[PDB]
Enzyme design. Structure first.
Site, PDB file in Angstrom:
ATOM      1  N   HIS A 110       0.777  -1.440   0.140  1.00  0.00           N
ATOM      2  CA  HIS A 110       0.020   0.159   0.004  1.00  0.00           C
ATOM      3  C   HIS A 110       0.721   1.450   0.127  1.00  0.00           C
ATOM      4  O   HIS A 110       0.263   2.268  -0.366  1.00  0.00           O
ATOM      5  CB  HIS A 110      -0.676   0.061   1.367  1.00  0.00           C
ATOM      6  N   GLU A 152      -3.393  13.402   1.740  1.00  0.00           N
ATOM      7  CA  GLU A 152      -4.726  13.196   2.467  1.00  0.00           C
ATOM      8  C   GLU A 152      -5.346  14.177   3.349  1.00  0.00           C
ATOM      9  O   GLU A 152      -6.412  14.734   3.009  1.00  0.00           O
ATOM     10  CB  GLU A 152      -4.101  12.136   3.553  1.00  0.00           C
ATOM     11  N   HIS A 205       6.363   7.058   5.743  1.00  0.00           N
ATOM     12  CA  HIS A 205       5.933   6.525   4.407  1.00  0.00           C
ATOM     13  C   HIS A 205       5.190   7.843   3.985  1.00  0.00           C
ATOM     14  O   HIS A 205       4.874   8.987   4.619  1.00  0.00           O
ATOM     15  CB  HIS A 205       5.053   5.457   4.602  1.00  0.00           C
ATOM     16  N   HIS A 207       4.315  11.276   6.138  1.00  0.00           N
ATOM     17  CA  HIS A 207       4.036  10.841   7.632  1.00  0.00           C
ATOM     18  C   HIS A 207       5.274  10.156   8.415  1.00  0.00           C
ATOM     19  O   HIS A 207       5.512   9.041   7.965  1.00  0.00           O
ATOM     20  CB  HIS A 207       2.513  10.015   7.569  1.00  0.00           C
ATOM     21  N   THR A 228      -5.003   6.592   8.718  1.00  0.00           N
ATOM     22  CA  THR A 228      -5.787   6.999   7.581  1.00  0.00           C
ATOM     23  C   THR A 228      -5.790   5.668   6.946  1.00  0.00           C
ATOM     24  O   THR A 228      -6.296   5.502   5.568  1.00  0.00           O
ATOM     25  CB  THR A 228      -5.191   8.029   6.760  1.00  0.00           C
ATOM     26  N   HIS A 255       2.238   9.111   0.897  1.00  0.00           N
ATOM     27  CA  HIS A 255       0.823   9.006  -0.043  1.00  0.00           C
ATOM     28  C   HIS A 255       0.809  10.022  -1.138  1.00  0.00           C
ATOM     29  O   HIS A 255       1.239  11.057  -0.836  1.00  0.00           O
ATOM     30  CB  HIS A 255      -0.505   9.563   0.925  1.00  0.00           C
TER      31      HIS A 255
HETATM   32  O1  LIG Z   1      -2.373   5.878   9.002  1.00  0.00           O
HETATM   33  C1  LIG Z   1      -1.432   6.351   8.641  1.00  0.00           C
HETATM   34  C2  LIG Z   1      -0.862   7.412   9.629  1.00  0.00           C
HETATM   35  C3  LIG Z   1      -0.109   6.174  10.608  1.00  0.00           C
HETATM   36  C4  LIG Z   1       0.336   4.964  10.263  1.00  0.00           C
HETATM   37  C5  LIG Z   1       0.893   4.113  11.280  1.00  0.00           C
HETATM   38  C6  LIG Z   1       1.329   2.771  10.736  1.00  0.00           C
HETATM   39  C7  LIG Z   1       0.525   1.857  10.043  1.00  0.00           C
HETATM   40  C8  LIG Z   1       0.331   0.582  10.971  1.00  0.00           C
HETATM   41  O2  LIG Z   1       1.182   0.190  11.731  1.00  0.00           O
HETATM   42  N1  LIG Z   1      -1.015   0.248  11.000  1.00  0.00           N
HETATM   43  C9  LIG Z   1      -1.649  -0.913  11.932  1.00  0.00           C
HETATM   44  C10 LIG Z   1      -1.832  -0.507  13.237  1.00  0.00           C
HETATM   45  C11 LIG Z   1      -2.204  -1.542  14.103  1.00  0.00           C
HETATM   46  C12 LIG Z   1      -2.535  -2.727  13.582  1.00  0.00           C
HETATM   47  C13 LIG Z   1      -2.389  -3.032  12.067  1.00  0.00           C
HETATM   48  C14 LIG Z   1      -1.870  -2.024  11.208  1.00  0.00           C
HETATM   49  N2  LIG Z   1      -1.355   6.763   7.289  1.00  0.00           N
HETATM   50  O3  LIG Z   1      -1.926   6.038   6.405  1.00  0.00           O
HETATM   51 ZN   LIG Z   2       0.089   7.556   6.282  1.00  0.00          ZN
END
Ligand SMILES: O=C(CCCCCCC(=O)Nc1ccccc1)NO
Ligand SMILES: [Zn+2]
EC number: 4.2.1.1
Length: 257
Positions: free
Chosen positions: A61, A103, A91, A116, A195, A93
């Site tokens: 993604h 975003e 990362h 981010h 997000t 977007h």
């Molecule tokens: O959501 C965001 C900003 C913060 C992202 C944090 C990392 C993503 C991640 O680890 N997601 C996750 C958390 C808990 C369980 C499963 C996946 N951008 O898309």
């Molecule tokens: Zn992000």
């Protein structure tokens, strides 16, 4: 599974993740005339001198640059935060075209991409515990606009060929994230969510006012990545952004006037 396509994109996520219709979802549009200047907000403290990057990964993604978060090496403090937040990854977007990709939006304006920088609250001991708490994560959001090249981004751009498809990773040591910051650290802040699924409502968002500029050639290289794994039909990794969600009962605060 979820993604950014016509059949599995953001308008479908609520079926598997009902929090998608929750009260603290991100991203949001930042209406600059209705944001409240808060003189109680402290300047941000960004301590990235001892950052240790480890690896870059295409997770299907986006691509994540991962850091060693086993010690207080690269931390964010101050601003609206209580306590110490450790950097774990960054990362982006981005869009298929220069006029979309971010975003968050500012007075409905979209930027070409959004960076981010993800940090977790050390009082919760590990990242997986932090995402279950309302103050668990702090994400620094930085907008990218297309213009002059950003020299500190080029090392990232040049390795993308080696992680073209989902599941590929490469060693990525000695990268200094300070080269990705704008000159000013003025910001807006509000309580929000991840997000991407699982869309957990655990993020203090800190969105910087000043964008960084990147060149057309740099962002073009993001658009050559693939959502798919090796050997599968090619789907270009573009438009991996969620549209703005309702602000609901939230106030966006500004550190500046
Ligand atoms: O959501 C965001 C900003 C913060 C992202 C944090 C990392 C993503 C991640 O680890 N997601 C996750 C958390 C808990 C369980 C499963 C996946 N951008 O898309
Ligand atoms: Zn992000």
């Amino acid at each position: 599974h979820w993604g950014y396509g016509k059949h599995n994109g953001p308008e479908h996520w609520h079926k598997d993740f009902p929090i998608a219709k929750g009260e603290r979802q991100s991203p949001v549009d930042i209406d600059t005339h209705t944001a409240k200047y808060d003189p109680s907000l402290k300047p941000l403290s960004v301590s990235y001198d001892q950052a240790t990057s480890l690896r870059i990964l295409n997770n299907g993604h986006a691509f994540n640059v991962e850091f060693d978060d086993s010690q207080d090496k690269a931390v964010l403090k101050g601003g609206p935060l209580d306590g110490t937040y450790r950097l774990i990854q960054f990362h982006f977007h981005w869009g298929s075209l220069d006029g979309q990709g971010s975003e968050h939006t500012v007075d409905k304006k979209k930027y070409a991409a959004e960076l981010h920088l993800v940090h977790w609250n050390t009082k919760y001991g590990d990242f997986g515990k932090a995402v279950q708490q309302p103050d668990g994560l702090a994400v620094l959001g930085i907008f990218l606009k297309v213009g002059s090249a950003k020299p500190g981004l080029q090392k990232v751009v040049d390795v993308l060929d080696s992680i073209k498809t989902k599941g590929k990773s490469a060693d990525f040591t000695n990268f200094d994230p300070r080269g990705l910051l704008p000159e000013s650290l003025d910001y807006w802040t509000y309580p929000g969510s991840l997000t991407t699924p699982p869309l957990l409502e655990c993020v203090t968002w800190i969105v910087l006012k000043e964008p960084i500029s990147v060149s057309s050639e740099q962002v073009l290289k993001f658009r050559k990545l693939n959502f798919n794994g090796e050997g599968e039909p090619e789907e270009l990794m573009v438009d991996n952004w969620r549209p703005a969600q309702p602000l609901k009962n939230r106030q966006i605060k500004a550190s500046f006037k």
